Amino acid sequence: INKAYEVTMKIQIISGFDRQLTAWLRVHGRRLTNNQKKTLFFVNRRYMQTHWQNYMLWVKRKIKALGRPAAVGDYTRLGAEIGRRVDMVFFYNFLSGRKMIPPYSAYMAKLNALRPADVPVK
Amino acid sequence: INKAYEVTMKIQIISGFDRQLTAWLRVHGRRLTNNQKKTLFFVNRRYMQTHWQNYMLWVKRKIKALGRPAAVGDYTRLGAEIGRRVDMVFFYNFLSGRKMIPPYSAYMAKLNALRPADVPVKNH
Numbered sequence: 390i391n392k393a394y395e396v397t398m399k400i401q402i403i404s405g406f407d408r409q410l411t412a413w414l415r416v417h418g419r420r421l422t423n424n425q426k427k428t429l430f431f432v433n434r435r436y437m438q439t440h441w442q443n444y445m446l447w448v449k450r451k452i453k454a455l456g457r458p459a460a461v462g463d464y465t466r467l468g469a470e471i472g473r474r475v476d477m478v479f480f481y482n483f484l485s486g487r488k489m490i491p492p493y494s495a496y497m498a499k500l501n502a503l504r505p506a507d508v509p510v511k
Numbered sequence: 512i513n514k515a516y517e518v519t520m521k522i523q524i525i526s527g528f529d530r531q532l533t534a535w536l537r538v539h540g541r542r543l544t545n546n547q548k549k550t551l552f553f554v555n556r557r558y559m560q561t562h563w564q565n566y567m568l569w570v571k572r573k574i575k576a577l578g579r580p581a582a583v584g585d586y587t588r589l590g591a592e593i594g595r596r597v598d599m600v601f602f603y604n605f606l607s608g609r610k611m612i613p614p615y616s617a618y619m620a621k622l623n624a625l626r627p628a629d630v631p632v633k634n635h
Binding site: 432435436439440480483487488489491492494496 | 554557558561562602605609610611613614616618
């Protein structure tokens, strides 16, 4: 059930990365402009996209290792695990500590405007 | 810091960062696209811009410590030292290591097309 599986995983991964960022922003957000905050949310979606194949390699081996028929809920749980086990807070700290949060551009707004279920992955 | 001094520093810093990137690329650039390489050259300019206030305080201290009035040759030297010693390699490793090199955008090509002397910084 391929796309139901991709959708629940994307929702959980983005949700999880977004939780890390919103938590981080409560501590560090004072210093950043609203555009810089939106850029970091873009970063979350882009990070998921550029690591999607690696997450799928790994998810494929975890389902396989179920010795069981995968239900969509398996995918929900594997996505939630990626969402909390990727250290995005390190990434925010490094990027902001290097003063290199990129400018908020229309192409970033475009990605942020999609529903999480529709964020394109390959 | 006066305009003439600003200009020799931007030239030397961008040149130094560019040399560091050119070096790093020999090791780490085999599988990047031309686009991705051009983004890291943009990153060098952007890095200088966002660290400009930091470099200006460092420069002020170095100049206070010179033991004589400063002249443009001192600023050329300090810009070259920043160009050499900032570690752009830890930043290039971070972007490439995480597969987060940004796409090459039109605004980036615009910044890359300026002469280093004309890259805007907050110094006016």
